[PDB]
Amino acid sequence: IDVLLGADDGSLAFVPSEFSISPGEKIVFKNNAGFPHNIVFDEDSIPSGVDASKISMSEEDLLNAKGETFEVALSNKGEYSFYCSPHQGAGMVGKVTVN
């Protein structure tokens, strides 16, 4: 599935920000607008025994050009909360369920 970082009007949002995938399905996060952006999974808000480090960016890492992507595949089922670190307070957060 594809997920925009930033809406086409420059809003600080994931598009879409809530979605479900099947296990081992890849997510392509693409830098669209209002970057730099990143994608961090909340270590306290993912399925038990998942290593966040394996599925996220560092808080200190950035995508800073139009069309940079980050891709991940999730296999444990459950809900995964993520955010963009610099824009978290703007409300650039999301949630995926692996079902």
Per DSSP bridges, beta strands 69-73 and 78-83 are unpaired
- The DSSP 8-state label assigned to residue 53 in this structure reads H
Instruction: Pick the stretch among 14-22, 57-65, 67-75, 88-96 that binds Cu ion (CB under 5 A).
Output: 88-96
Q: Is 44 helix (H, G, I), strand (E, B) or coil?
A: coil
Instruction: Pick the stretch among 14-22, 45-53, 63-71, 79-87 that binds Cu ion (CB under 5 A).
Output: 79-87
- Catalytic pick among 5, 27, 32, 37: 37
Q: Is 59 helix (H, G, I), strand (E, B) or coil?
A: coil
Site string for Cu ion, 35-74 (x = CB under 5 A): --x-------------------------------------
Taking the least distance from each CB to Cu ion, the nearer of 80 and 82 is 82
Cis omega (within 30 of 0) for bond into 86: no
